[PDB]
Design an enzyme around this catalytic site. Structure first.
Site, short mmCIF file in Angstrom:
data_model
loop_
_atom_site.label_atom_id
_atom_site.label_comp_id
_atom_site.label_asym_id
_atom_site.label_seq_id
_atom_site.Cartn_x
_atom_site.Cartn_y
_atom_site.Cartn_z
N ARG A 1 -13.49 5.54 40.27
CA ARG A 1 -12.70 6.47 39.45
C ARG A 1 -12.01 7.56 40.29
O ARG A 1 -11.34 8.43 39.73
CB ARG A 1 -13.56 7.13 38.37
CG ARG A 1 -14.25 6.17 37.39
CD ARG A 1 -13.35 5.03 36.95
NE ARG A 1 -13.85 4.36 35.74
CZ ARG A 1 -13.47 4.65 34.49
NH1 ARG A 1 -12.55 5.59 34.25
NH2 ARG A 1 -13.99 3.97 33.48
N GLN B 1 -26.33 -1.31 52.84
CA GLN B 1 -26.72 -1.85 51.55
C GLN B 1 -25.72 -2.92 51.15
O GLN B 1 -24.51 -2.68 51.14
CB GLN B 1 -26.74 -0.72 50.50
CG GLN B 1 -26.96 -1.16 49.05
CD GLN B 1 -26.96 0.01 48.08
OE1 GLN B 1 -26.11 0.11 47.20
NE2 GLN B 1 -27.93 0.90 48.25
N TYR C 1 -28.12 12.83 48.07
CA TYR C 1 -27.01 12.01 47.59
C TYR C 1 -25.69 12.46 48.23
O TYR C 1 -25.35 13.65 48.20
CB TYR C 1 -26.96 12.05 46.04
CG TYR C 1 -28.29 11.60 45.47
CD1 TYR C 1 -28.54 10.25 45.21
CD2 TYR C 1 -29.32 12.50 45.27
CE1 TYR C 1 -29.77 9.82 44.74
CE2 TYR C 1 -30.57 12.08 44.80
CZ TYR C 1 -30.78 10.73 44.53
OH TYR C 1 -31.99 10.30 44.08
N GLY D 1 -32.56 12.51 32.39
CA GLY D 1 -33.98 12.20 32.31
C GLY D 1 -34.81 13.44 32.11
O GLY D 1 -34.83 14.33 32.96
N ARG E 1 30.47 35.49 81.96
CA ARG E 1 31.88 35.84 81.96
C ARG E 1 32.58 34.94 80.95
O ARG E 1 32.63 33.73 81.13
CB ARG E 1 32.48 35.66 83.35
CG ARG E 1 31.93 36.65 84.36
CD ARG E 1 32.07 36.16 85.80
NE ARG E 1 33.46 36.14 86.23
CZ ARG E 1 34.08 35.11 86.79
NH1 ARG E 1 33.45 33.96 87.04
NH2 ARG E 1 35.36 35.23 87.12
C1 LIG Z 1 -22.53 7.90 46.72
O1 LIG Z 1 -23.44 6.82 46.87
C2 LIG Z 1 -24.47 6.86 45.93
C3 LIG Z 1 -24.70 7.87 45.02
C4 LIG Z 1 -25.76 7.77 44.13
C5 LIG Z 1 -26.02 8.77 43.20
N1 LIG Z 1 -25.20 9.92 43.14
C6 LIG Z 1 -25.48 10.98 42.26
C7 LIG Z 1 -25.52 12.27 42.74
C8 LIG Z 1 -25.80 13.33 41.89
C9 LIG Z 1 -26.03 13.11 40.55
N2 LIG Z 1 -26.31 14.23 39.72
C10 LIG Z 1 -27.22 14.18 38.68
O2 LIG Z 1 -27.88 13.20 38.36
C11 LIG Z 1 -27.36 15.43 37.92
C12 LIG Z 1 -26.28 16.27 37.73
C13 LIG Z 1 -26.45 17.43 37.02
C14 LIG Z 1 -27.68 17.76 36.49
C15 LIG Z 1 -28.76 16.91 36.67
C16 LIG Z 1 -28.60 15.75 37.39
C17 LIG Z 1 -25.98 11.83 40.06
C18 LIG Z 1 -25.70 10.77 40.91
N3 LIG Z 1 -27.05 8.67 42.34
C19 LIG Z 1 -27.79 7.56 42.42
N4 LIG Z 1 -27.62 6.55 43.28
C20 LIG Z 1 -26.60 6.67 44.13
C21 LIG Z 1 -26.36 5.66 45.05
C22 LIG Z 1 -25.31 5.76 45.93
O3 LIG Z 1 -25.08 4.76 46.83
#
Ligand SMILES: COc1cc2c(Nc3ccc(NC(=O)c4ccccc4)cc3)ncnc2cc1O
Ligand SMILES: COc1cc2c(Nc3ccc(NC(=O)c4ccccc4)cc3)ncnc2cc1O
Ligand SMILES: COc1cc2c(Nc3ccc(NC(=O)c4ccccc4)cc3)ncnc2cc1O
Lengths: 450, 450, 450
Positions: B15, B73, B100, B137, B437
């Protein structure tokens, strides 16, 4: 009856981390204390007693022309003690308004209301409602009269719910100030004489204390560091922008507009994003100001368009003129009606007559240029190596060819024509054509190193 | 005990609609994953296991100098499966923090708190309170211990009211990670191994799971598209601006200020609206930066004023110098103390000595200019047609007249004077005056076609 | 079935304090009423009946090319009376949507929903929920059908709590409009015929009135002064910016971005803070736009970088070109692929061929420049004093030395070399080298006045 003011301005402002004293930091280009001094004057204050201390030398230099009484504070013993240093100069029968040099946004209008609400021999106290009043002195009313101000650490559960708090700004007569200030004690955890005690003392003498609420909390907020100052700056600029918008100035984005001084405007004035207006600026009718422009102390006539990224200072621009983009007018630039100043052009201390054009890559300084001249690209007015900066006089209807160097002092009379690439050191007469005779070497069959 | 990190960074970021992988998009000029790598290093991480996948080739090229372990991965099977690819490299007796690559604003400070809260052989879980926790969650505590994380679709009416949610960031020891990750199953609607199950598994083994709350929700927010990225950018810039304001930098509008790198500052530094600071920038005391300026990798000495719409890169400016408006310093510009560079002036890979002035419509490149020189308007340093770009050497106390062409390689010795409109191809000696000049044709009574 | 629109646009807009009529004030560079006219057209309106009055002469001149029916209103007698002036031109069997020329942000999408909800021989009414509905006409439903609109001063305590209010936008068939409008009376405190009465009259005839809620309240807000207009401008720009961000345009700060027209974009386009896009702009893939740039009616090819403070209009830029900083492209500038235009350079109505460079302090106008040319610093294309502006033709592989004056009409053929400081008045042949022979006076031991 008469009015005088006391402004507290002695604080160091340690959390500014500055060599300046607290109140000399600016809002809209003007020191915080100067905002308050001006407001006091707008109210018609007869005297303005300025309590000062830290950075005293810099206060004196920066505020040397202010009509204030210089009351030096040598020690911090609270607001009542500070004000008492000024009290010998209070007239018994004048009102005294107490103000703070680090709370710059207090308005004349709010203070007029406050002064009108002051009951004879009583006090008018400025208050404000907060959603979270934690840490502020709660206003205690009995019936509908203010009887005390209860500080956070003293307040009971029921008092802590009171949303109306003390701002510190108050009005009373001079006699009452001299009397009550003398009865203020300092038997407290800070060992300071507090001005808040005047509310009790007034009620003690069967004198009434009336409360007036501020319009906006920002009127009574003080700036203790640059973050808080920035917040006051933004609130003030938004307020300025809103006023101008309601007067009919089209400001494309008021969050990206700055006024640091005064603006007088005509109708149908348009101001694009990221413009800065400084000092005293006058714009006529239908003036259009493009993005990124800076105008400091300028008068702009009707129907002028200033295109993007132009910087103007101490200049005058006649009606229907066209400036920019990327134009620089330095102090003493005077452009007549229907003139044209273009990109990468610098005009300094010069007059440019009606209909004349200076459109590219040009410096004109210390010059008089007449009406309907054509000042070509790359033209430069310059001096001989040595002393002062002498004048270039160009008459009416002159054509100055591109890349001409005009070497002052020199005069070019009406209707002259100067060819491109010329160096003009001697005067040019009326209707005289001057063209540079070039010597060139021509080599045929020159193969470039490519 | 020791610490290492695992950073998940394999996502495509569909996206974003970009040829870049998700985590290479920048905040404050620095890729999201690089923010996280740096934070991990600030925490004292011994190893940094980077789980990567999509845009793997570009990850390697863009992050080639990062001290990370490159764990590829090949398939998405959830967070527990991703982390398990790194787990063979965990030391049994080190802590492991999971992070992350698309959640760039996680702070060292929050992570220190998290790591300290981790009970022996247990887990420290990062949580956050949301007003509307829908879709996140829910953290289930029994007594004051975290026992499970219940997903939106599983939660009952009472659980849906829980405001404390899972952020995904956690700390445990390596032995415990290897053990529990092996017990994670994927019998769910996505068919993925979830890291959230480690909370259950820990409690299963009578190990404690402690929760620590993040300061700001923006620390745990991920950017899934450019809109969300822009929101992280703005929050980060405001945070940077606030820090500088509290340190005493006067930033006139922090909403119109950008820092993309590092800033070292003196006292009483003033920065007007729409300034951009990039790379490593050092500003001395009382530096004033006007509106619209861009500074990238520069050192600016005490008391320097940079006026509006100046662009500086890989440059050094000595104390009390004056730059702008509309000045361009390109890489290798070195300006000594008390120098003056004016509008429509470009300086490239040149040294300019003390007190010298270059004030209008000038290009100086590959040059050495001495002290107290006057470089007139329209002066250009240039080369012959052909190969490399040779040097112009100008000594001390030289006057170079307006519109002079200095044709490198050439030397002008101390105290020389060069008249306007001159082409300098041969060396000029000490105290030598060179004046052009000119041959001019004068025609009297030339009536202009007007 | 068919659709036509009625747009109310007769108001004076007194609180704009302008010589313009209310609806000609712009949002995103386009008059408010033109937003509404365009939306009506997007909906597939067959006729657009424009009710106009104040500033009628200016309406006609500014909107002369609009496909609208010009219905002049001579007196204000309410919305029903205004619409009735258009009603003789309604077709009995077409839908009619009523819209307001000072409520510019109403969307096609919201109006499609409204039109679909209209029951046969009934009315579809646009409504909106407000937290504080004070002063707006409350929507009264019985069962789930709208039966009346109760005005603030008429509403009872229970009705004042209704949050759903009337926006004024409605759809019904032409026959029903002609019928019901004739039954509207003006026996009220304003003495005006109100369109709100059609809701009652419909229910009177056992016709259904269905309500549809607007997405955003800003769709139905009118601008009565410049402050309100600025708020609509900011909401609209944020909406535009958000759309572009979600399409994958990297806009560094959407609060500092302005689109005033249409933008077509490739992938991985980056736009820094304070950029303004006007008219019809097309950006290819990986275009980078630096801070402060203004692009009006331009086509920019793939991989082009436009550096800060560049202003471009009616121009075309080929792939991999490099523009800026401080570049000015005026109308008719056409830059081929891999070209370079640098600081303080102005290009007007000229073509510049592949690989050519124009990097400093230069004006090129009315010119054709070939491929792989080197246009040195300070080069100026100029004309003789007199009439029209003639052309300079420069071929391929030409070197033009710094400060050269090219005096049109003139031609420089392929592979020519022109030395610095030259004035070119006669044609230059293929592989011809032209160098200026200078006369200089050298005076030794000249002690400067220092
Ligand atoms: C960028 O690559 C990845 C990101 C991931 C990823 N990113 C991510 C980062 C932050 C959030 N944030 C939250 O879950 C969140 C946000 C606000 C409040 C509470 C939780 C969610 C997903 N989450 C899980 N698996 C992932 C695997 C990846 O290869
Ligand atoms: C700058 O010099 C002084 C400032 C003082 C000073 N400044 C000040 C100004 C405004 C506030 N504002 C409020 O107390 C406040 C703010 C918001 C809502 C209610 C009250 C507080 C302190 N207050 C008291 N004594 C002062 C003495 C000084 O020498
Ligand atoms: C500009 O010319 C006219 C505007 C009118 C006009 N403009 C207008 C547009 C929008 C609103 N907006 C609302 O009533 C509103 C706003 C927010 C929420 C709910 C309703 C109000 C008046 N309304 C009624 N008669 C009008 C007649 C005109 O000749």
């Amino acid at each position: 009856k008469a009015l005088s003011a006391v402004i507290l301005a002695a604080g160091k402002g340690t959390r500014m981390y500055s060599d300046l004293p607290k109140v000399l930091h600016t809002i809209a280009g003007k020191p915080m204390v100067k905002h308050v001094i001006d407001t006091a004057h707008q109210l018609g204050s007869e005297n303005i007693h300025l309590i000062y201390g830290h950075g005293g030398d810099l206060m004196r230099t920066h505020l040397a022309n202010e009509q204030v009484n210089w009351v030096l504070q040598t020690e911090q013993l609270g607001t009542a003690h500070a004000v008492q240093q000024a009290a010998p100069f209070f007239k018994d029968n004048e009102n005294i308004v107490v103000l703070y040099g680090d709370a710059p946004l207090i308005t004349k209008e709010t203070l007029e209301k406050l002064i009108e609400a002051k009951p004879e021999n009583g006090i008018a106290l400025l208050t404000v409602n907060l959603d979270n009043p934690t840490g502020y002195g709660r206003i205690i009313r009995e019936n509908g009269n203010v009887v005390a101000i209860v500080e956070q650490k003293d307040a009971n559960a029921e008092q802590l719910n009171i949303k109306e708090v003390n701002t510190g700004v108050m009005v009373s007569d001079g006699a009452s100030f001299k009397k009550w200030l003398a009865r203020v004690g300092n038997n407290n955890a800070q060992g300071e004489y507090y001005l808040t005690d005047l509310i009790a003392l007034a009620n003690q003498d069967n004198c009434q204390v009336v409360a007036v609420q501020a319009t906006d909390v920002m009127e009574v907020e003080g700036a203790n560091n640059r973050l808080q100052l920035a917040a006051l700056e933004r609130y003030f600029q938004n307020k300025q922008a809103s006023k101008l918008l309601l007067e009919g100035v089209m400001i494309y984005d008021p969050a990206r507009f700055d006024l640091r001084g005064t603006l007088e405007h005509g109708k149908d004035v348009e101001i694009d994003v990221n413009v800065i207006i400084e000092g005293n600026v006058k714009l006529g009718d239908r003036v259009k100001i493009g993005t990124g422009c800076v105008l400091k102390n300028v008068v702009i006539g009707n129907d002028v368009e200033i295109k993007p990224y132009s910087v103007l200072e101490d200049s005058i621009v006649g009606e229907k003129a066209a400036i920019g983009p990327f134009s620089r007018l330095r102090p003493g630039a005077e452009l007549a009606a229907e003139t044209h100043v273009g990109n990468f052009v610098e005009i300094k201390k010069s007059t440019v007559g009606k209909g004349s054009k200076v459109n590219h890559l040009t410096y004109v300084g210390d010059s008089e240029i007449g009406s309907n001249c054509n000042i070509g690209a790359g033209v430069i007015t310059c001096n001989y190596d040595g002393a002062n900066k002498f004048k270039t006089i160009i008459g009416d209807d002159v054509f100055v060819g591109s890349d001409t160097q005009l070497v002052a002092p020199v005069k070019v009379a009406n209707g002259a024509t100067i060819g491109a690439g010329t160096t003009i050191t001697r005067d040019v007469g009326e209707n005289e054509l001057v063209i540079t005779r070039v010597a060139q070497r021509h080599i045929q069959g020159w193969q470039r190193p490519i």
